[PDB]
Amino acid sequence: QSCVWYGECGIAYGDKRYNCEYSGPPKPLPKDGYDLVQELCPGFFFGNVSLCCDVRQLQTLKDNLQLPLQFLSRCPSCFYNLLNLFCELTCSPRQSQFLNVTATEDYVDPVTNQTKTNVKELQYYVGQSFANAMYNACRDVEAPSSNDKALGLLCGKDADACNATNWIEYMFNKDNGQAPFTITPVFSDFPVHGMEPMNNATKGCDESVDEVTAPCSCQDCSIVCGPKPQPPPPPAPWTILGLDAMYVIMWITYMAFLLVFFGAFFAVWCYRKPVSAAFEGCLRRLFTRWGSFCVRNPGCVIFFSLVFITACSSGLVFVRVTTNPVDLWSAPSSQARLEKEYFDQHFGPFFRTEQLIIRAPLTDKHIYQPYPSGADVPFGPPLDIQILHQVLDLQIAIENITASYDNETVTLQDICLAPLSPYNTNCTILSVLNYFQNSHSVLDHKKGDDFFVYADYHTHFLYCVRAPASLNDTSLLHDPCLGTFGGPVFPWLVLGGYDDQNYNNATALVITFPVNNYYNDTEKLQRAQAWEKEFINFVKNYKNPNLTISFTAERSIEDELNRESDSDVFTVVISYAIMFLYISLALGHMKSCRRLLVDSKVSLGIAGILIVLSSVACSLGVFSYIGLPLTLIVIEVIPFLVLAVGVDNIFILVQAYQRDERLQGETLDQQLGRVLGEVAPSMFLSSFSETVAFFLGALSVMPAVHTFSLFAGLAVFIDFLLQITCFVSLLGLDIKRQEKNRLDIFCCVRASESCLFRFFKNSYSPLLLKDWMRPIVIAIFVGVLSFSIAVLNKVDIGLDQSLSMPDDSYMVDYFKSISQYLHAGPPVYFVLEEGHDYTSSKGQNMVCGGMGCNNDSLVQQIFNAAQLDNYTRIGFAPSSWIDDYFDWVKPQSSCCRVDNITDQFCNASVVDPACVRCRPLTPEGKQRPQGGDFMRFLPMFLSDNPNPKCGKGGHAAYSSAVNILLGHGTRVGATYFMTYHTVLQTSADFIDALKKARLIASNVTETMGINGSAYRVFPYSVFYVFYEQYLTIIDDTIFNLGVSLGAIFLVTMVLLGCELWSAVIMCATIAMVLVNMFGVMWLWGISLNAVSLVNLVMSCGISVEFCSHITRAFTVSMKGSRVERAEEALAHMGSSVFSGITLTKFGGIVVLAFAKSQIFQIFYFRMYLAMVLLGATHGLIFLPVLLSYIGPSV
């Protein structure tokens, strides 16, 4: 071997210097540029260099490799081969084997008068199997700020006809302007002239160069990237013979019923062609005696009852109302609640977001034409320069807002969050103007001379949507796009309306203002909300006819719902007023026109209404004393229920008395005691059946059903007691009044067979019970039940979240804008709990997405999930911190650097006095820092800032994502890897996201193989606490309804004697009522949530109020046949049940039909109408017939 040239003494032009000829042996390197030899091509570094090379040559080589390094360094396997073509060309130790100089001439030294030999020209023999493997591995490298091929900018011509041989000729040719002298390559695989070219090892875009440099991406290599992933979409519909397969199982279940049912009548119709009485008797006697007592001791009874009422209802002073949505919709110990408790403790609560979807409707899209060459690039309307200036003006004004609070000003700079503070304090604003750093200057500056612009803001936008974490454009612009706060701005968070990569086509601009959310602190939260109110007002009063903004504040949903939840109290008040008017006017039988205001029960009806309201208030007050807080579901469903039950009892009693004829020689208190002893068992059965049902239903973990059950049970019981005592005393007093000829309400001025009882008895009961009508009724009701069972499993789950808002609100527009434009959703945090090692090869492989770490690790699994992005609603990559930590610590990167004597972190921008690299640049140092080096360099990484020479640093993104536990070796605590969800528009979307995130977390926890369950991965998102209730709502409904109905069943079959048949008939009728309630749900579009569940558990209590009465009046009867017993029970009890509860609630609902609120008109008006009329029909038209048919004899 031998050399051809050494040193650089000649000069071509500018600074280009021709290498100086020397054909001696290879020089031992001067020990000066060892760093360079390990940076250019370490293939020569095995010390005893004896390199033909020169330190003045190595450092002049690197200067020419500057631009080729920037483009081709994207793909390590490419730039690797490119270097092997240069070192050997310049200073390899066997240079003479593959080189032959051609043109040289003497050079004069201005230093010694010594003529030096320059190297003017020469030819370079390169193998063909080398140039093909080189060009073929780089042809796929894409350029920055474009989708072209990187060779198009390095060939000297189009990248469409770049042969592998012409590209090498252009690089060595001085015609480009870089080569100080041109080298003529000679391509040949076989030795010619006794001279055989060089062919060193080569690597493709798929093979990795080192056990630490990951292979090339399929963006930059066509062979690495294969078949896309795909999930199997299961619909899981049965569709027996073409239709839903449930529509059919029933219609076949029904046709069978009419034939097996109508096939027995027409079959027979052609054929004809001791302990119970002991418990049912002591109750009558007890109630008779106590009724007489209460009728002859009104003063004592009423006084003690009023004292009790006051003692119980004075607890309303301690009344608390629950409005915080977390406490409302989240169980205090649910999985999501514990996860939120864990995340808020180790990482601080999730922040508050104020977004802004700006759009330019007037402007049109325009075309961008690159100067040198390239296809046209169209830009959306909002990406116009004028619209960008106006949006920058709007944002700078949004920063003004001060929003004084508590006699102090509250600026955004004060409330927002700055990741890397107090070094940099601006704060996180996520807009597309951060690419230009919120500067009109940086946005409006172009580089070029007339007739064309070299660069423009289009070029910067295109470059930075591709690489949003750069610190300089480094190509004809030299501007960073990191953002004033420090840290990348991802194009999918700041744009909307494009198509899958083309942020050029964006039609909307998103602008987020992250604000701190505080964990157990109220002064700061008040400050944030006080600033948000002024932000909302400002954005609402901004005209800018060029823009259409759809905004939101963190405090906006709560305000919109508190604004819609009123202006209908004027309707509820009229509803209750009409209910009370009817109750007051209907208790009294007329019997005469000239005797009206004397036989009137207005005062007694007022007393009954007051007793009912008193029962409500005593329940609320007792539970206020105990400490249970109220709720807006309770405050609305308790009055309805308690009024229904109380009015039913009042009418039952008053009418059972009015239709009674007094025996002779029998006094008033004895007559009333007899009437009450014969009427009280039914009211007691109903009251006990409902109380036990509700109290027993207060076992669920749903905060909406638990509190409601408690409140309603106590109210029903207290109302029963207050009635049985106070109302009987007042009934005795009013009977005295009416017998002493005293006039009605004003004062002291001196049998009935009600018109309804004469209708149910004379025209309705006989007709309904004829032999040609009972089968019709049963057929119709079984058909409706069959329909309900068929369309049952098609009921929705969840609440829309757009119907809780008024229709004239801006949140409706914001939701439309989200669904129509946004491409990202709420962020997800896959929190890896405390207990992982992180300081071992395997402990790191389980978490990596990288070179050597496993293929099923946490980061790789989240990456796959994001590759699905439709099955798994995870849209983007995990963005792990440990990969960035390793990239930072790698010696090549050379961001880490410690002080030599102090072992202190020398920044990457430092005078370089005595600071050495953290990891030695050797084969052992390349590896990951697995031992104590990991934990010795991690804190310095997390404290590093975004240095222009280093890169992004690990402070603005991971200081909060990594928890370090000082003391005891200072291990790592809990950490998270945060990604983003896909746009979630409906409750189905949110529940689907919750399910599949949980699935991914469980998969990762499985693969990690933890000893026991010491720790685990879990995802945290903001809406998880609000949507975790819909993951068990079906079984919650099942449990609640079944338990409530079984309690009703047992209580009935116990109190009513022991008749299981009567109890089972009643239970079956109430189950029918519930199934038909679900059918009406499906048919009118009511959804299954914590409001519908409360209304169903409530209806379970009015079904009883109808059935129990009708069925008990039938059971305890001594008529002859079932038909006559049924019609007698119907007349007697159903005349009071139809007039008391049915007509009252019907007037109420008909007044309530004018609600003006969607949540109300959907979940209360419709549910109440359905419940009331369904229960009325079922009881009064199906208990009669079913009992007539299969009732218990006696």
Ligand X SMILES: *[C@@H]1O[C@H](CO)[C@@H](O)[C@H](O)[C@H]1NC(C)=O
Ligand Y SMILES: *[C@@H]1O[C@H](CO)[C@@H](O[C@@H]2O[C@H](CO)[C@@H](O)[C@H](O[C@H]3O[C@H](CO)[C@@H](O)[C@H](O)[C@@H]3O)[C@H]2NC(C)=O)[C@H](O)[C@H]1NC(C)=O
Ligand Z SMILES: CCCCCCCC/C=C\CCCCCCCC(=O)O[C@@H](COC(=O)CCCCCCCCCCCCCCC)COP(=O)([O-])OCC[N+](C)(C)C
Ligand U SMILES: *[C@@H]1O[C@H](CO)[C@@H](O[C@H]2O[C@H](CO)[C@@H](O)[C@H](O)[C@H]2NC(C)=O)[C@H](O)[C@H]1NC(C)=O
Ligand V SMILES: *[C@@H]1O[C@H](CO)[C@@H](O[C@@H]2O[C@H](CO)[C@@H](O[C@H]3O[C@H](CO)[C@@H](O)[C@H](O)[C@@H]3O)[C@H](O)[C@H]2NC(C)=O)[C@H](O)[C@H]1NC(C)=O
Binder of residue 426, out of ligand U, ligand Z, ligand CLR, none (CB less than 5 to 8 A by kind): ligand U
Site for ligand CLR contains 557 (CB under 6 A)? no
Where is the chain discontinuous (C–N over 2.5 Å), named by the preceding residue? 273, 750
Site for ligand X contains 441 (CB under 6 A)? no
β-pairing, 366-368 vs 916-917, is unpaired
Shortest approach of ligand Y to residue 162 CB, angstroms? 18
The answer to whether 19 is a known ligand-binding residue is: yes
Binding residue for ligand Y, selected from 70, 484, 502, 546, defined by CB under 6 A: 502
Shortest approach of ligand Z to residue 797 CB, angstroms? 5
Euclidean distance between CA atoms 70 and 451, whole angstroms: 29
Which CB, 390 or 437, lies closer to ligand U? Answer: 437
How far is C-alpha 500 from the geometric centre of its chain's CA atoms?
23
Site for ligand CLR contains 64 (CB under 6 A)? yes
Site for ligand Y contains 219 (CB under 6 A)? no
Complete DSSP assignment for 396-457: HHHHH----BTTB---HHHHB--SSTTTS-S---BSGGGGTTS-HHHHH--B--TT--SB-H
Binding residue for ligand V, selected from 158, 521, 807, 869, defined by CB under 6 A: 869
Site map (CB under 6 A) of ligand U, residues 437-476, x = contact = xx--------------------------------------
Number of H helices, E strands in the chain: 43, 19
Euclidean distance between CA atoms 7 and 18, whole angstroms: 9
Binding residue for ligand Y, selected from 504, 575, 854, 872, defined by CB under 6 A: 504
* DSSP 8-state assignment for residue 725: I
Binding residue for ligand Y, selected from 183, 336, 356, 377, defined by CB under 6 A: 377
Instruction: Identify which range of 137-145, 233-241, 485-493, 502-510 contacts ligand Y by CB under 6 A.
Output: 502-510
Shortest approach of ligand V to residue 235 CB, angstroms? 13
Site residues (CB under 6 A) for ligand Z, limited to 767-826: 793-795, 797
Instruction: Identify which range of 369-377, 459-467, 770-778, 1017-1025 contacts ligand Y by CB under 6 A.
Output: 369-377
Angle at CA of residue 612, ends 611 and 613, nearest 5° = 95
Euclidean distance between CA atoms 937 and 940, whole angstroms: 5
Site for ligand X contains 819 (CB under 6 A)? no
Complete DSSP assignment for 1132-1177: IIIHHHIIIIIHHHHHHHHHHT----HHHIIIIIHHHHHHHHHHHH
In the chain, what is the straight-line distance between the N-terminal and C-terminal CA atoms, in Å? Answer: 124
Closest CA to 726 of 1140, 1144, 300: 300
384's torsion region: left (phi>0), alpha (psi -120 to 50) or beta?
beta
Shortest approach of ligand Y to residue 383 CB, angstroms? 11
Site for ligand U contains 484 (CB under 6 A)? yes
Q: Where does residue 1105 rank: exposed (0-12), middle (13-18), buried (19+ CB within 10 A)?
A: buried
Site for ligand X contains 110 (CB under 6 A)? no
Binder of residue 502, out of ligand X, ligand V, ligand Y, none (CB less than 5 to 8 A by kind): ligand Y
Which CB, 544 or 867, lies closer to ligand V? Answer: 867
Please tell me the count of residues contacting ligand CLR according to CB under 6 A.
16
Which CB, 268 or 988, lies closer to ligand Z? Answer: 988
Name residues whose C-beta falls within 8 Å of residue 1066's C-beta, 6 or more positions apart in sequence. 1048, 1049, 1052, 1104, 1107, 1108, 1111, 1183
Residue 1156's CB is within 10 A of a number of other CB atoms, namely 13
Which CB, 424 or 960, lies closer to ligand X? Answer: 424
Binder of residue 914, out of ligand Y, ligand X, ligand CLR, none (CB less than 5 to 8 A by kind): ligand X
Q: Are 293 and 724 in contact (CB under 8 A)?
A: no
Q: Is residue 422 reached through a cis peptide bond, with omega within 30 degrees of 0 on the bond before it?
A: yes
Site for ligand U contains 424 (CB under 6 A)? yes
Length of the chain counted residue by residue: 1194
Q: How far is CA 944 from CA 517, 839, 961, 963, in A?
A: 25, 21, 14, 15
Binder of residue 378, out of ligand CLR, ligand Z, ligand Y, none (CB less than 5 to 8 A by kind): ligand Y
Instruction: Identify which range of 375-383, 688-696, 1066-1074, 1157-1165 contacts ligand Y by CB under 6 A.
Output: 375-383
Residue for token pair 């008024």: 806
Alpha helix locations (H) across 927-1016? 932-943, 987-1008
Instruction: Identify which range of 21-29, 285-293, 888-896, 1037-1045 contacts ligand Z by CB under 6 A.
Output: 1037-1045
Which CB, 274 or 545, lies closer to ligand X? Answer: 545
Euclidean distance between CA atoms 814 and 89, whole angstroms: 63
Instruction: Identify which range of 71-79, 110-118, 246-254, 902-910 contacts ligand X by CB under 6 A.
Output: 902-910
Shortest approach of ligand Z to residue 1082 CB, angstroms? 8
How far is C-alpha 173 from the geometric centre of its chain's CA atoms?
60
Site for ligand CLR contains 1044 (CB under 6 A)? no
Q: Are 135 and 159 in contact (CB under 8 A)?
A: no
Q: Are 287 and 293 in contact (CB under 8 A)?
A: no
Site for ligand U contains 426 (CB under 6 A)? yes
Binding residue for ligand X, selected from 780, 999, 1153, 1194, defined by CB under 6 A: 999
Site for ligand V contains 1121 (CB under 6 A)? no
> What amino acid is encoded at 354 in this protein?
E
The torsion of the CA quartet 1125, 1130, 1131, 1133, rounded to 10 degrees, works out to: 110
Site map (CB under 6 A) of ligand X, residues 508-547, x = contact = ------------------------------------xxx-
Shortest approach of ligand Z to residue 819 CB, angstroms? 18
Site for ligand Z contains 1093 (CB under 6 A)? no
Binder of residue 981, out of ligand Y, ligand V, ligand X, none (CB less than 5 to 8 A by kind): none
Site for ligand Y contains 376 (CB under 6 A)? yes
Shortest approach of ligand Y to residue 376 CB, angstroms? 3
User: Could you tell me where the beta strands, DSSP code E, fall in 294-361?
Assistant: 356-359
Binder of residue 438, out of ligand U, ligand X, ligand Y, none (CB less than 5 to 8 A by kind): ligand U
Residue for token pair 């990191």: 482
Site for ligand Y contains 809 (CB under 6 A)? no
The answer to whether 57 is a known ligand-binding residue is: yes
Q: Are 378 and 490 in contact (CB under 8 A)?
A: no
Euclidean distance between CA atoms 984 and 874, whole angstroms: 11
Site residues (CB under 6 A) for ligand X, limited to 452-491: 472, 474, 478
Site for ligand Z contains 1042 (CB under 6 A)? yes
Binding residue for ligand Z, selected from 358, 1001, 1074, 1131, defined by CB under 6 A: 1074
Site residues (CB under 6 A) for ligand Y, limited to 54-73: none
Q: How far is CA 762 from CA 590, 755, 767, 1131, 1139, in A?
A: 20, 11, 9, 9, 17
Euclidean distance between CA atoms 346 and 103, whole angstroms: 71
Q: Are 521 and 332 in contact (CB under 8 A)?
A: no
Residue for token pair 């004075």: 314
Site for ligand CLR contains 90 (CB under 6 A)? yes
3-class SS at 285? helix
Binder of residue 484, out of ligand U, ligand V, ligand CLR, none (CB less than 5 to 8 A by kind): ligand U
Site for ligand V contains 501 (CB under 6 A)? no
Q: Which residue positions form the known binding site for cholesterol?
A: 19, 57
Residues of this chain that interact with ligand V (CB under 6 A) are 869-870
Residues of this chain that interact with ligand CLR (CB under 6 A) are 19, 57, 60-61, 64-65, 67-68, 86, 90, 154, 171-172, 176, 178-179
Residues of this chain that interact with ligand U (CB under 6 A) are 424, 426, 437-438, 484
Residues of this chain that interact with ligand Z (CB under 6 A) are 793-795, 797, 1034, 1037-1038, 1041-1042, 1045, 1071, 1074-1075, 1078, 1088
Q: Which residue positions form the known binding site?
A: 19, 57
Residues of this chain that interact with ligand Y (CB under 6 A) are 375-378, 499, 502, 504-505
